[PDB]
Structure formats: structure tokens, C-alpha cells
Amino acid sequence: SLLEFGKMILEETGKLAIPSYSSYGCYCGWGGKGTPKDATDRCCFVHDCCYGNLPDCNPKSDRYKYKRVNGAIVCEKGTSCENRICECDKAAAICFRQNLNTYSKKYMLYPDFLCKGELKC
Ligand SMILES: O=C(O)/C=C/c1ccc(O)cc1
């Protein structure tokens, strides 16, 4: 679910999902178009694609369970949708952690019309 994703993001990065990742760049948050702005935005592009791979799941609202083993996120076994949603979220949260070094506050609330370019999943 979106709230669990937000908690996983905070756990990983130490940033609050809202506002750090809810409206960032072209892809983080509602909607997506154009060329991602940076590596963090690319995390969101791929997360969007990952949710797009699950047209008959409901990633915003379906809750999954996970634990940590030696630090690392381990998605626990729920329904097939829940497992797949968890893997998408885990990847994006790790990706955000990996790209905190280039995160730029200039991309928060980035305006949609500047999202020029084209990117297929
Ligand atoms: O917290 C939210 O409401 C959603 C954040 C979000 C993070 C990555 C995305 O690819 C799309 C939305």
C-alpha cells in the first residue's frame, strides 16, 4: 500500500515520503511523462513501470508484509499481487537509498510542462 511504501522509504532514506518523494521530478508521485530528471526520478520511472506490470493488482491500497534480515528488506509471502507489489516497492526504496547522493531539492514540486522528452518502460 502507499502508506507502507512511504514507511519503507522513510526507513531506507531518513526522508519523509511526503514531501521528499511525492512530487519529485517527472515521475515521483501522481503522473509521469518525459525524460526523468535524475537518478532518483529514474527510480520513480521504474517504479511506475513496475506497478504497470501489475494491471490486475491494486498497489496503492493492497497491503503486504516485509521484514529485515541483516538489514535487508525481505518481502514475506502474501497473495501473488502482494508479493509483486512488495518487490516493486523494495526496489524503489533501495534505489532511493542508492541515489541519495544526487537527490536535489530543486526537483521537489517540479512543474509538469518541463517534463520534455520520451521514455518507454
Ligand atoms: O507516497 C506517495 O503518494 C507516492 C510516492 C511515489 C513514489 C514513487 C513513484 O514511482 C510514484 C509515487
**Ligand 1 environment, Cβ below 6 A:** 2, 6, 17-18, 21-22, 27-29, 44, 47-48, 92
Q: What letters, b where the CB count within 10 A reaches 16 and e where it falls short, cover 28-63?
A: bbeebebebbbebbbbbbbbbebbeebeebebeebe
CB 18 within 8 A of CB 31: no
CB 39 within 8 A of CB 46: no
Q: Are strands 28-29 and 66-69 parallel, antiparallel or unpaired?
A: unpaired
- CATH number among 3.20.20.70, 3.30.565.10, 3.40.190.10, 1.20.90.10, domain 1-121: 1.20.90.10
Q: Tell whether the torsion through CA atoms of 63, 50, 29 and 89 is positive or negative.
A: positive
Name the catalytic one among 41, 56, 62, 89. 89
Expressed in Å, this structure's resolution amounts to 1.2
The DSSP secondary structure of 15-49, one letter per residue, reads S-HHHHTTEETTTEES---SS-SSHHHHHHHHHHH
Experimental technique for the deposited model = X-ray
Query: Catalytic site residue 89?
Result: yes
CB 103 within 8 A of CB 37: no
Residue 19: cis peptide before it, omega within 30 degrees of 0: yes
Distance CA 62, CA 58 (A): 6
Determine if residue 29 is labeled as part of a ligand binding site: yes
Rounded to 5 degrees, what angle do the CA atoms 69, 73, 109 make?
Answer: 150
Rounded to 5 degrees, what angle do the CA atoms 19, 17, 83 make?
Answer: 150
- Any bridge partners for residue 108, and if so which? 24
